[PDB]
C-alpha cells in the first residue's frame, strides 16, 4: 500500500514577476467514478466464452478450446495436454450415460433448437458429436502430424 | 476543501424484537480515503462485536 503525500506545490507568478510555490492540500481518489452513465471503455470485462448454454449457433465449449487460443503449439507438454484433453473428451462422449436421452423428430422445434427442459435429453449428444468433429478438424494435425524426434 | 461535513447514520430495525443495525458513513467531498478508514473500523470491531455475521465495505467515493 502506497500512502498519499498530502501536499503539492504549484508555481505562481506575482504581478512583479516573482515565482514561488503555493502549497495545496490534495488527496487522490480511491473509488472509480462509475455512478455516471457515460461509458469510457476502460474496464476489465468478465470472460464468458467457457460457458455451455443452449445456443445451437455455437459449439459446445471443450477444454481444448482454451488450448488452441493462441499458444505456442511447438511446446511438448502443451501437445501432451491437448492429446489428453481430446482423449478425455472422446472417452466422455463414448461412455456417456444415454439412459433418458431420446432423439425423435418433434415439429415444435423447427425454427429453434430443442427446448430448455429437453436440452440434456435431445441436444446434448448431438452438440457433443458436432464439437468432436469441429475439434477433430483443428487438432488432427497436432496430435498426428504428417510424415516428413516426435513429441 | 477547507470544510468537511460527515454523516454517520445507522438504521435500527427490530429483527424478532432485537435490534439490527444498517450503518452508513457519508462524507461531504471527494478525496477522503474511505478504503483506509474502513480497515480501521474493521480492525476495531473484530474484538468488540458479538453477532452472527457483519460486513464493512466501501460503496461510493463518499
Amino acid at each position: 500500500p502506497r500512502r498519499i503525500p498530502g501536499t503539492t506545490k504549484v508555481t505562481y507568478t506575482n504581478k512583479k514577476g516573482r515565482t514561488f510555490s503555493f502549497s495545496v492540500p490534495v488527496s487522490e481518489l480511491t473509488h472509480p467514478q462509475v455512478t455516471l452513465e457515460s461509458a469510457a471503455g476502460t474496464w476489465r470485462e468478465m470472460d464468458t466464452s467457457f460457458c455451455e448454454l443452449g445456443d445451437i449457433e455455437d459449439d459446445m465449449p471443450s477444454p481444448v478450446d482454451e488450448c488452441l487460443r493462441g499458444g505456442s503449439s511447438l511446446d511438448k507438454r502443451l501437445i501432451q495436454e491437448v492429446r489428453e484433453r481430446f482423449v478425455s473428451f472422446c472417452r466422455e462422449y463414448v461412455l456417456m450415460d444415454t439412459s433418458g436421452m431420446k432423439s425423435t423428430i418433434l415439429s415444435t422445434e423447427l425454427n429453434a433448437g430443442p427446448d430448455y427442459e429437453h436440452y440434456d435429453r435431445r441436444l446434448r449428444r448431438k452438440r457433443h458429436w458436432l464439437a468432436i468433429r469441429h475439434r477433430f478438424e483443428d487438432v488432427r494435425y497436432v496430435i498426428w502430424p504428417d510424415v516428413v524426434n516426435p513429441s | 476543501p477547507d470544510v468537511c461535513v460527515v454523516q454517520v447514520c445507522d438504521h435500527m430495525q427490530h429483527d424478532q424484537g432485537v435490534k439490527r443495525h444498517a450503518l452508513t458513513i457519508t462524507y461531504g467531498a471527494d478525496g477522503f480515503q474511505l478504503r483506509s478508514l474502513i480497515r480501521r473500523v474493521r480492525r476495531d470491531l473484530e474484538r468488540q462485536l458479538s453477532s452472527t455475521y457483519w460486513q464493512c465495505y466501501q460503496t461510493n467515493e463518499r
Binding site: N14, K15, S21, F22, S23 | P1, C4
Partner: peptide, 18 residues
C-alpha cells in the same frame, strides 16, 4: 474545519496583495 498549513496556501492569495 481544515487546519492551516505551515507553508503558504492558495487561500492566503487575497492576503498576497495586488
Amino acid at each position: 474545519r481544515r487546519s492551516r498549513r505551515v507553508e503558504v496556501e492558495p487561500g492566503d492569495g487575497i492576503a498576497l496583495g495586488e
